[PDB]
Subunit: 413 residues, 4 copies
């Protein structure tokens, strides 16, 4: 299906073969784990049911071409809807059965599945946050079925994403009812997963906007505020998508670090936006700064990426319409994140940033700084200290110095 016989192999950074990896060596050992284990790369997923069966075959062909172990899918992208909900689910069941056998034969694993509650017109007002309770019931039936399929196929995570949960205008929005109903829907899904013994990690993917004016899981901190408010934080981690970070006005590594220090870095969608375009372009990730600094955050996460992966939720350019461009595009993104891993790991091993940070904040490990951190110091004792009028000498933050190191490691590692 992809104009490409054979598999893409690692050929080193000097190779001029456009169908070879320059940096992704799956077997390269980095800090005691292989690149394959560090990155856990995932790949995204005639008419009617015949087109669907052919899509199955093409998905696993591509997984074999790229030597990728993990895939993801949305229900409505693997099978067409029927004339009833029953027939929709029969069509899905049939295609799931084909996928399950391919997974067994090929040894491929389901990183996550999800429900597409975005495409069909019934979701024009959203799904959980719809104004039409009939749509909420259909959305529950659809996610119910998707949790069944996630359990059947052994999904390691299950994703809820922004779709159409937000608003076009606050003028016609009952904000409390929509947010309450979102929280009800998510808890109902948690209840159902527990009842069927589905032990995948639940993930929410923040997205700030597009196609809606505002979408409720705006960024990591906004989603965490909602999760904490509704007693859902214990059930959900975040699926962080690079382009959605920058759409929200943050760097990717900002979202990742916020997620990390709240125990909620669950998985990533590796792509990139165009910061001069206010929409979500979902380009395959090529920026070596973004991939280096993303893997820097991931490598410090408990268990690294953990049960998540580096998932290529990305779109070939409109002008890269040939089948082979799908292979070129993944090679672009896989080599960019493999280089990012190499560079990040060496930055971490050399404490290239950590030693500067240790020195920056050293005052909080001695004297009055230690007393602040320990809780001994209060406004009375801090004032008495400052009333000594000891000269205050700040230290440079060395931003340009560190930026030179980042450039040096990107090139030299």
């Amino acid at each position: 299906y992809f104009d490409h016989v054979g598999t893409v192999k690692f050929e080193g950074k000097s190779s001029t073969n456009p169908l070879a990896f320059k940096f992704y060596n799956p077997d390269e050992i980095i800090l005691g784990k292989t690149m394959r284990e560090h990155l856990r790369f995932g790949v995204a997923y005639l008419s009617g049911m015949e087109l669907a069966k052919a899509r199955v075959e093409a998905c696993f062909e591509l997984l074999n071409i790229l030597d990728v172990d993990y895939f993801c899918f949305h229900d409505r992208d693997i099978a067409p809807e029927g004339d009833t909900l029953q027939e929709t689910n029969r069509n899905l069941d049939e295609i799931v059965a084909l996928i399950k056998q391919h997974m067994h034969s090929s040894g491929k694993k389901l990183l996550w599945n999800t429900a597409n509650m975005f495409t069909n017109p019934r979701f024009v007002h959203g799904a959980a946050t719809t104004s039409n309770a009939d749509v909420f019931a259909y959305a529950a039936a659809q996610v119910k079925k998707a949790l069944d399929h996630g359990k059947e196929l052994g999904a390691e995570n299950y994703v809820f994403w922004g779709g159409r949960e937000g608003y076009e205008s606050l003028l016609n929005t009952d904000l409390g009812l929509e947010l309450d109903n979102l929280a009800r829907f998510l808890q109902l899904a948690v209840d159902y997963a527990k009842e069927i013994g589905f032990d995948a990690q639940f993930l929410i993917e923040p997205k700030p906007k597009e196609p809606s004016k505002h979408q409720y899981d705006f960024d990591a901190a906004t989603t965490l505020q909602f999760l904490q408010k509704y007693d859902l934080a214990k059930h959900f981690k975040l699926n962080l998508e690079a382009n959605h970070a920058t759409l929200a006005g943050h760097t990717f590594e900002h979202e990742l670090r916020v997620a990390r220090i709240n125990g909620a870095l669950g998985s990533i969608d590796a792509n990139q936006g165009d910061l001069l375009l206010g929409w979500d372009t979902d380009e395959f990730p090529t920026d070596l700064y973004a991939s280096t600094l993303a893997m820097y955050e991931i490598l410090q996460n408990e268990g690294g990426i953990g049960r998540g992966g580096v998932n290529f939720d990305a779109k070939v350019r409109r002008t890269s319409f040939e089948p082979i461009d799908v292979v070129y595009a993944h090679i672009n993104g896989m080599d960019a994140f493999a280089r990012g891993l190499q560079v990040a790991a060496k930055l971490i091993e050399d404490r290239a940033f950590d030693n500067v940070i240790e020195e920056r904040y050293a005052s909080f490990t001695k004297g009055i700084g230690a007393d602040i951190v320990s809780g001994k110091a209060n406004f009375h004792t801090l004032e008495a200290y400052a009333l000594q009028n000891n000269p205050i000498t700040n230290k440079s933050g060395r931003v340009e110095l560190l930026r030179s190191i980042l450039n040096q490691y990107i090139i030299n590692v």
Copy 2:
């Protein structure tokens, strides 16, 4: 001296007097309350101490010119630093006593005061989130003094703003330590206000960025996430500044509604940015959509603006450098928000929006929708409902219709 003898007075929407209110009639009653009480307008603040005393005289002259009942100040904006912290506080105490005098003779009240921990170079790395423990101690001494002065002058609120609390680069940032230390600082402040019996409402003002790349209290939701995480939410509401809403990628009314439904709409700074400029211009508020929709949110807040007010944290344009421009600018903003109050109050009384919202979400007050809201319905019963395959018919959201009504009321109320 503002080149202006006497008071600005209401002269109706027909007046061509540039130094007269066209819409702010302080005694006009709207829904059982005067404009004065709805809006609770606030105004925000030779060398050395003589320049400082002159500035006090100019501030209360302006309060009298504008017939404004409330003012705000920052400590380092009202008095110069001395050669020691002791002398800085002596200078500040002397000016605070001159302010207390003018409050006596004029009856004007302190809406809030705050510590300016932005201007002096000791705060280059921040205040609570500084890398230098000596700066943390100075910041504590400064806020301790400001809480004393707030108590002494009867401040109804006390504001913490995000001046230097954030980062220039995550490369050199110990994020967890900075946020832990910000939470420690705010809790120490809470402790001290309780010890001295300072009963003002504590407020945090979100700001997403500028001057720094990222500032931690990015928007209402992000600040609420931090407050909830560190058990501080019970002590703080938000001071919402309109320009900071749009700088964060939200409308002002979005930030206000989010705060409102989390019980955290404490006060507002009334200004406006330029959405084509990304840098916090703090212009006086002139946009009648923004003022109407801000007042629409405030009127539905418990107690209206409550102990807060509509505070003109705004700057005349660089090209409006004459004294009289300060009066023109305030008339601009006071009339904009008075018109917004009139229009919003009639939109609420007529239920121009509430009737469309009521009909939009009516399905959640009966049938399967009521069972969703009550918790009776789960995935099993919702699926059984959806499996009936009853046709789903959504209703239009009528955005353009409501925008017509908004235009009509802004013009015709």
Copy 3:
């Protein structure tokens, strides 16, 4: 449209949702009726059966709204065939039905255009394509549209951004693409001359979307291109409000730049959302933007001239009932009619012009007159400044002027 009658003016107090609150087509404003000031335009089963039905729905909507002008794109009014010949046969057949409807209903064609955006052949652009075969098809399509524009009496003809730009400079021959864009536009000019097509040629700037950069980025950038290639004498601009803010400008900025360069040809009335980086094409509702747009248009030579105020806008995705098309045009028609009322009174009252006159009075006398005349040079200006006479600037009065704007929007 689930609304059989005609929408009429019922004044500002009316609570009829299907009535104009500000657009009174007959109201006289500075010697001209609202109808002729604004020249409102409306922008336009399977296969040919669906095509014919859409013609009927178009003119049904023109009658509901009492609108005199319409626009269309060729590929939006007729389906393609299995050959170019068949595509033009389908197109000709629908054009014949539109012409009869124009005669019977009295409606006029503001402009037509060629849609060289949808079909996959234009993936790399039309005039700026990398594939010469596509350039040829593009020329054939515009040729046919110039013929239909002549046949239907189009007062303008529009070239718009579509796919003329780049996704990446890494693979772009910029000089060739711009040279070919100019070649294509000249050929079009050559052909309009042959058949006696007299309509005003217009270029619509768009800075980006779907592409990373589109070459007619804004008014000034398109003007730089037209001047470089000796095409400025043949083209004016079709200015769309959303494209101004997408380019980082206010709509009134683009309108004034176009106006002082004699290139304000026509407008597409809509609005974006300045918090969303994409071209939302909402029906215009912002009274500031509509007031200040009509302020610029009223000062253009002949007002909007041969152009019009064309509602190139889409209903919200959540406004999916037929009646919402009517509600949305009422929203935008009333917003721009109010804009005209306020702008005309501001102009009549010289509310801004008197302030501008005083602001720059220094350039009508003394050393300022010698600067303007060309008499003053660096030598005589230095001698003047070396007198060290005090410089006293005057306030720009921006906050004062904004209060006036608010007052007129509410009061006129």
Copy 4:
């Protein structure tokens, strides 16, 4: 004084010396020319006259530390104003005499000088586009003096920059008069340079905004529209500043290519913005994509950078306040652009992009495409060709392929 002493020297990519160039080897020959000549790096430029004289010393000390051959200055940055214009020019002349001798003894060259008509409050409304003719006269006297000084010191270019030439609001702007006066002023300057024999390349620096809402030289194409309209294009090239390109919504390499194909790539100011911050941050350039692609456009320019240079119009971060950070910051930017030159030259030498472009547009060098370029093809004949209905087959744009190549050369060159 810069805490350094000695010269920064090249130590190669593996050095761990923070005070050594890792990529800038001034003597390395690349396509027949040294790095030093390719890049022509430029560096930017007690109270009263004593502080001014100390600044002269510190400037040339830094030029010797960095081994940089070119510098720039603004008149009001090198000498304080006097109590009269005569005194201002006497102060300026005295400092210019000191700089002239330093240039002779040190062998450093003046890349460009300019007039600062931004700081003093007389320019609150602008300079050439002021509303006050008295200010226009002062502006004329100041530029006249700067052209005198530029000729005396042998400036190779002379810069006009954005300052406050724009508007705060169109409500109070006579746009035609301001633009006419801008053109008059620039022609007066051209006249005067001719009269004194000043042979430097005149340059205009585009800037879209900040501090003003709109600045007239918005970007390259907008400035070119102005230069063509007023018959000034024959006299001016552009000084392209990287942060101003992105502030205007363009990439830096876009502005450079637009300048280059219009004969107007005169010089550059090498810095970078933050595309998530809406204001002009003027950070030292570190992004290897931006520096690579900028040197890519420059190397294809007639004569490369020509009489211009790669000028570091950049500011150290607020938090990098130690003197040594100035050295670290230039090492960061000089190594970034030296690496950019290495990578760009090999990309150009290998025709890594040019061969893909040659094939992409091959259709225009034969058949109907040649008739199009030749002018022979017209609408009648192109339609005849299209009416044969021959299959249209487009070829992929290969963007992801090309991005992989860019990444590979950045690492491997």
